[PDB]
Ligand binder design. Structure first.
Ligand SMILES: *CCC(=O)N1CN(C(=O)CC*)CN(C(=O)CC*)C1
Lengths: 596, 17
């Protein structure tokens, strides 16, 4: 047999086993999250250990087939994926210690609990306890206690483990010939050896940096307006030319500013436009919410959900007889088996959340047409973006009027649109500077540009210069404020929230063109456009078979992330924000501190 | 890391395993 004939025999034998072992691991994982029991955890851990043991074994054996000696492209793409999924370069000791540090960091973040100085029994977990305070409170010194305690109790437990994690991840990446762990992550977006569609890891830094420059005038104006507003709402505490204190931004980190809507509303005199009331008045339950999300995808030409979907999904909180993990989450288990786990409540938020999650399911179902190792979105940014364009169309007045949640004669005026856009901006453009800077700091840690003795010094310097946000109290190198966020302490890349945000508005604009939308991009609803669904479908089914550069090009007509469709979405708000700021200082001191 | 993902929510690394 040729090497190329031995490679087919190896893949055919690998895929048969993978199909079985992945379904065993996915099904056991779902069963635990739906019903937390000792039996379910044993099953999940074993099924997981077998899957993993099998995949590292098969990744070693794939090196017997030089990829260059493979005419057939689909077996090469697979053998490459299978070569990339291997984990047998790091020493046994360091590999075991690295796992141990991942579990420890994961556990101290999930077990993180802080107790009040004013109450030694007022101990408060992060969810729902400290998140409650950090979403809702208007109490500076209460917000400050939750912010500071979280970082100085949980964060300080992470600093040592995070130093040991950095050195051990850098060893594995360099052992694979990557410059560092951050370079290894930028690997997700690498396209090498496809003429026309190639993309490097440094290309990614430049394109983030370049698109961020174009986003900055909008963030600056959003920042100055949100500040002028936070002044009225904290009159002693906020400088008109300074960064916003980190503890006042509507969550534990300022990752999103969504919860500042009530303080920042451009026209608070316009009534609430939440359709939760109509859902209650029309007696909507979880079935109806998911049944209405199903209809939206059929309107664009995509399939109905499966019998298995309706028979196996868990769309309501099971009660106390059965214990479940209530994070909204779409599952692709293998072997035709798709599901959603969601403790759905009759609210507009959950209605939107369902379209996002069912988006993930549409993606999974389309790329079932690909071989196993290519059942993956074109890059880590794609799934999130496919989710978000769904809620983009569903949240529109046009769509709500069409499904009866908004009266046929709802009157959309500039005030309603500016309110809509300001809300979207707090959530979407707010998170961009946060998301950029956070990854920038890790890129630099891993690269070796930031010494451990200057980790927190540079962290807050970058927060002040890029995010325009300042710490309320000084932090020494005893803290690991970054590790105080789930993604940092649980070893997940974060630039995906930057890329998906540009990809989503590129997607929306292209699909709204196919659907012959008329005016403002923000008003568009792809519902009823089979043409728009086709354009989506064609990328969706590709999975990770083509370069993400091509996949994007198919839908939008361009080979790279582009910021213009995003700036285009919020152009009306930008013009209004600039007029509201015509007397405000736009920009921020990098030195002013609440403790200065 | 794992060939492909069976969900699109990032879960804590402790149940992982
Ligand atoms: C092979 C994938 C895997 O085992 N994991 C990633 N993951 C998911 O695919 C579900 C979203 C989370 N995992 C768990 O099952 C939690 C331990 C691990």
């Amino acid at each position: 047999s040729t090497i190329e004939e031995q490679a087919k025999t190896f893949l055919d034998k690998f895929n048969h086993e993978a199909e079985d072992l992945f379904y065993q691991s996915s099904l056991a994982s779902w069963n635990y999250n739906t019903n937390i029991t000792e039996e379910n955890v044993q099953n999940m851990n074993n099924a997981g250990d077998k899957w993993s043991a099998f995949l590292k074994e098969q990744s070693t054996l794939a090196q017997m087939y030089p990829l260059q000696e493979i005419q057939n492209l689909t077996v090469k793409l697979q053998l490459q994926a299978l070569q990339q999924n291997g984990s047998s370069v790091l020493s046994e000791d360091k590999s075991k210690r690295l796992n141990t540090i991942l579990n420890t960091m994961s556990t101290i973040y999930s077990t993180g609990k802080v107790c009040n100085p004013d109450n030694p029994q007022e101990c408060l977990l992060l969810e729902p306890g400290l998140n409650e305070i950090m979403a809702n409170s208007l109490d500076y010194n209460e917000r400050l206690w939750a912010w500071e305690s979280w970082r100085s109790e949980v964060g300080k437990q992470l600093r040592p483990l995070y130093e040991e994690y950095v050195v051990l991840k850098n060893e594995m990446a360099r052992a694979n010939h990557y410059e560092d762990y951050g370079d290894y992550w930028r690997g997700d977006y690498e396209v090498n050896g496809v003429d026309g569609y190639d993309y490097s890891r440094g290309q990614l830094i430049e394109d983030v940096e370049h698109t961020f420059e174009e986003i900055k005038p909008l963030y600056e104006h959003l920042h100055a307006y949100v500040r002028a507003k936070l002044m009225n709402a904290y009159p002693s505490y906020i400088s008109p030319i300074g960064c916003l204190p980190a503890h006042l931004l509507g969550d534990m980190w300022g990752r999103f500013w969504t919860n500042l809507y009530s303080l920042t509303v451009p026209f608070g005199q316009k009534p609430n436009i939440d359709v939760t009331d109509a859902m209650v008045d029309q007696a909507w339950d979880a079935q109806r919410i998911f049944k209405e999300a199903e209809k939206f995808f059929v309107s664009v030409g995509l399939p109905n959900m499966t019998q298995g979907f309706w028979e196996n999904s868990m769309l309501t909180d099971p009660g106390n007889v059965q214990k479940a993990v209530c994070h909204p989450t779409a599952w692709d288990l293998g072997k035709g088996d798709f599901r959603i786990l969601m403790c759905t409540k009759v609210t507009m938020d959950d209605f939107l959340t369902a379209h996002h999650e069912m988006g993930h399911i549409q993606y999974d179902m389309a790329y079932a047409a690909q071989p196993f190792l290519l059942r993956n979105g074109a890059n880590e940014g794609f799934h999130e973006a496919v989710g978000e364009i769904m809620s983009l169309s569903a949240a529109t007045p046009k769509h709500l009027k069409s499904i009866g949640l908004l009266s046929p004669d709802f009157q959309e005026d500039n005030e309603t649109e500016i309110n809509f856009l300001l809300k979207q901006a707090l959530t979407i453009v707010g998170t961009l500077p946060f998301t950029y800077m956070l990854e920038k700091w890790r890129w630099m840690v891993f690269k070796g540009e930031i010494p451990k003795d200057q980790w927190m010094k540079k962290w807050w310097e970058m927060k002040r210069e890029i995010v325009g946000v300042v710490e309320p109290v000084p932090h020494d190198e005893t803290y690991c404020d970054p590790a105080s966020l789930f993604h940092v302490s649980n070893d997940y890349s974060f630039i995906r929230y930057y890329t998906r945000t540009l990809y989503q508005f590129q997607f929306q604009e292209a699909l709204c063109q196919a659907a012959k939308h008329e005016g403002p991009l923000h008003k568009c609803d792809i519902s009823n456009s089979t043409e728009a669904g086709q354009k989506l479908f064609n990328m969706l089914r590709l999975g990770k078979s083509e370069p993400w550069t091509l996949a994007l090009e198919n839908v939008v007509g361009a080979k790279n992330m582009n910021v213009r469709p995003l700036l285009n979405y919020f152009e009306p708000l930008f013009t209004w924000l600039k007029d509201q700021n015509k007397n405000s200082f736009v920009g921020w001191s990098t030195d002013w501190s609440p403790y200065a | 890391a794992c060939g492909r993902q069976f969900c699109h929510t990032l879960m804590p690394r402790h149940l992982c395993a």
